[PDB]
Amino acid sequence: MKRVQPCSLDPATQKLITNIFSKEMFKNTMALMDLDVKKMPLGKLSKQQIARGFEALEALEEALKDGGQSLEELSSHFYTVIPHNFGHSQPPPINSPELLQAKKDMLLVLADIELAQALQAVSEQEKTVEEVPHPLDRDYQLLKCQLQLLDSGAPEYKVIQTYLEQTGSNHRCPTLQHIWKVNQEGEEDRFQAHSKLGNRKLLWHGTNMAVVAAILTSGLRIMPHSGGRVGKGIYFASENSKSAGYVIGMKCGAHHVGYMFLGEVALGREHHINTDNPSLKSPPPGFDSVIARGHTEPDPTQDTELELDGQQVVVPQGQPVPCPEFSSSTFSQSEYLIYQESQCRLRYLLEVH
Ligand SMILES: CC[C@@H](CO)NC(=O)CCc1nc2ccccc2c(=O)[nH]1
């Protein structure tokens, strides 16, 4: 029998690792995306299945753009590959660009669920080694990402807290529980190359809980089949309320639990837009970012700065105020886009109730 070594983690980090590696949380997410968890168990989920899923969605995309199969014939093949559960009734046809991108977004989450499952596989070295770490230490070690819990006294604590409270829902106030500094090793070098590229900003990136382990393992990515209102890049917001909309919040006890990322984004020369462009794959030449400007913006006169690795990083601190220039924008709130993974570094992780 193998000796289980004691857990080295603080209670808040243990709780976080318990939450983001939880089998029930992953199944819950699949259930919330109307996936058939009985026909698709966590352990049966595979890279081949997800690939076959995206192949079926691409065929549907070609039909949506000949004498080929009908949209219902092609939809039926997608549901055979990715079993859904609509109370065991006939699943609906994927006959619109809005339905298609939603199905792609579902598979991107499912790919991050499969990645967390693949990450937890027992290596041959582990089978030979005569002791084992506590399961939470093992999961933490697999992320290959340093997490450091901040106390109310850390220099950035009050700055982050003000950012959260001033730009979050005025009535549906997100309650801050914990902040971890995130040091993803193998993400430092690519981001540091952009040292001469300024206009650095700390921006929100909200996700569901089932993709947090994959992000701590791999960083924010520009995945194939990804997209949205401002194309194929990494989406950020300066308003917490915009990023919070993407946080489902899992029920636990008498409260909700969710996680939010803060990323350091080197925006450099910004290109501003006031209308949707799902076809963008990069900024225009000579630009380093695309900012879909909203009707509001956290009061720029209230911006502060944080020193992160000897670089000034703008941190908004004001409530949203109107922006007359973008009063007629198709965006109510700003969306910040970068099209190179190296222009982002994860910096903080927040637990919110
Ligand atoms: C493809 C769905 C998943 C895979 O992780 N993506 C997310 O949950 C990111 C969602 C998100 N979208 C935004 C869009 C505009 C502005 C901000 C955000 C944001 O914070 N998260």
Side-chain angles (χ1 to χ4, degrees), residues 104-106 108-109 112 204-208 211 215 221 226 235-237 242-244 246 334-337:
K104 286 179 185 193
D105 288 350
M106 174 280 285
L108 287 166
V109 175
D112 276 348
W204 302 103
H205 183 85
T207 71
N208 50 65
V211 303
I215 291 161
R221 296 139 287 156
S226 70
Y235 287 80
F236 296 96
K242 176 53 184 170
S243 290
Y246 301 96
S334 290
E335 298 186 17
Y336 291 71
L337 273 286

Side-chain angles (χ1 to χ4, degrees), residues 313-351:
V313 177
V314 175
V315 193
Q317 299 281 270
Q319 283 217 325
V321 298
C323 295
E325 207 198 316
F326 303 99
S327 56
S328 67
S329 184
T330 64
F331 297 88
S332 289
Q333 301 169 296
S334 290
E335 298 186 17
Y336 291 71
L337 273 286
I338 53 155
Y339 301 87
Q340 293 176 134
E341 288 171 14
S342 57
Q343 275 171 266
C344 172
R345 175 91 183 268
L346 301 166
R347 291 303 199 176
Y348 307 96
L349 174 74
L350 289 71
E351 181 176 293

